Structure 1
Amino acid sequence: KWTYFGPDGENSWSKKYPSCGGLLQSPIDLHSDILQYDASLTPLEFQGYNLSANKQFLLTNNGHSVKLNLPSDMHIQGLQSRYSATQLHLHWGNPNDPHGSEHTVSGQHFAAELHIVHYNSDLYPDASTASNKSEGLAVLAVLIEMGSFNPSYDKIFSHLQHVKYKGQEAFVPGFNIEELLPERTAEYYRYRGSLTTPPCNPTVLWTVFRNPVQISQEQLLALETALYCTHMDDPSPREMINNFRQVQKFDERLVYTSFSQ
Structure 2
Amino acid sequence: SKWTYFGPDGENSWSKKYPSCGGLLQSPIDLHSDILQYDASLTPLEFQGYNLSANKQFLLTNNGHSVKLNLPSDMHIQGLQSRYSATQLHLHWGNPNDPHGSEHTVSGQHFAAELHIVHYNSDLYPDASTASNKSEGLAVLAVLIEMGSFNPSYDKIFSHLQHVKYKGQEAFVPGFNIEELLPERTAEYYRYRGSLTTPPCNPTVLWTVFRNPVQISQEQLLALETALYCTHMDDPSPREMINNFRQVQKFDERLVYTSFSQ
User: Is the shorter-chain TM-score for this pair beyond 0.5, marking a shared fold?
Assistant: yes
Aligned pairs (5 A) from 1:166-205: 166-205=167-206
How far did residue 15 of structure 1 move?
Answer: 1.1
CA–CA distance in structure 1, aligned partners of residues 117 and 259 of structure 2: 19
CA–CA distance in structure 2, aligned partners of residues 231 and 253 of structure 1: 39
Taking structure 2 as the reference length, the TM-score comes to 0.99
Determine helix, strand or coil for the equivalent of 1:108: coil
How far did residue 253 of structure 1 move?
Answer: 2.0
Determine helix, strand or coil for the equivalent of 1:165: coil
How far did residue 260 of structure 1 move?
Answer: 0.7
Determine helix, strand or coil for the equivalent of 1:15: helix
Aligned pairs (5 A) from 1:39-54: 39-54=40-55
2:211 — aligned with what?
210
What whole-Å deviation, never above 9, does each CA across 1:166-194 have from its counterpart, x for those lacking one?
Answer: 11110001100000000000000000000
CA–CA distance in structure 2, aligned partners of residues 196 and 220 of structure 1: 21
Aligned pairs (5 A) from 1:220-231: 220-231=221-232
How far did residue 251 of structure 1 move?
Answer: 3.7
CA–CA distance in structure 2, aligned partners of residues 130 and 142 of structure 1: 22
How far did residue 252 of structure 1 move?
Answer: 2.2
Determine helix, strand or coil for the equivalent of 2:244: coil
CA–CA distance in structure 1, aligned partners of residues 252 and 200 of structure 2: 22
Determine helix, strand or coil for the equivalent of 2:206: strand
How far did residue 53 of structure 1 move?
Answer: 1.2
What whole-Å deviation, never above 9, does each CA across 1:90-113 have from its counterpart, x for those lacking one?
Answer: 000011111000000000000000
Moved beyond 4 Å, runs of 4+: none
CA RMSD of superposed structures (Å): 0.6
What whole-Å deviation, never above 9, does each CA across 1:109-150 have from its counterpart, x for those lacking one?
Answer: 000000000000011110000001112000000000011010
CA–CA distance in structure 1, aligned partners of residues 134 and 62 of structure 2: 26
Which moved further from structure 2: 60-69 or 9-18?
Answer: 9-18
Determine helix, strand or coil for the equivalent of 1:109: coil
Is the 2:25–2:252 contact (alpha carbons within 8 Å) kept by the matching residues of 1? no
How far did residue 55 of structure 1 move?
Answer: 1.1
Is the 2:24–2:252 contact (alpha carbons within 8 Å) kept by the matching residues of 1? no
CA–CA distance in structure 2, aligned partners of residues 255 and 120 of structure 1: 21
1:141 — aligned with what?
142
Structure 1, gaps ≥5 residues long: none
2:35 — aligned with what?
34
How far did residue 54 of structure 1 move?
Answer: 1.6
Determine helix, strand or coil for the equivalent of 1:73: coil
How far did residue 18 of structure 1 move?
Answer: 0.5
CA–CA distance in structure 2, aligned partners of residues 221 and 24 of structure 1: 33
CA–CA distance in structure 2, aligned partners of residues 75 and 253 of structure 1: 27
What whole-Å deviation, never above 9, does each CA across 1:200-239 have from its counterpart, x for those lacking one?
Answer: 0000000000000000110011101110001011111110
CA–CA distance in structure 1, aligned partners of residues 19 and 4 of structure 2: 16
Determine helix, strand or coil for the equivalent of 1:84: strand
CA–CA distance in structure 2, aligned partners of residues 70 and 91 of structure 1: 18
Determine helix, strand or coil for the equivalent of 1:26: coil
Q: Percent identity?
A: 100
CA–CA distance in structure 1, aligned partners of residues 136 and 154 of structure 2: 30
Is the 2:190–2:259 contact (alpha carbons within 8 Å) kept by the matching residues of 1? yes
How far did residue 6 of structure 1 move?
Answer: 1.1
CA–CA distance in structure 2, aligned partners of residues 95 and 57 of structure 1: 28
CA–CA distance in structure 1, aligned partners of residues 106 and 14 of structure 2: 25
How far did residue 86 of structure 1 move?
Answer: 0.2
What whole-Å deviation, never above 9, does each CA across 1:149-177 have from its counterpart, x for those lacking one?
Answer: 10000000000000001111100011000
CA–CA distance in structure 2, aligned partners of residues 237 and 135 of structure 1: 37
How far did residue 52 of structure 1 move?
Answer: 1.2
Is the 2:91–2:115 contact (alpha carbons within 8 Å) kept by the matching residues of 1? yes
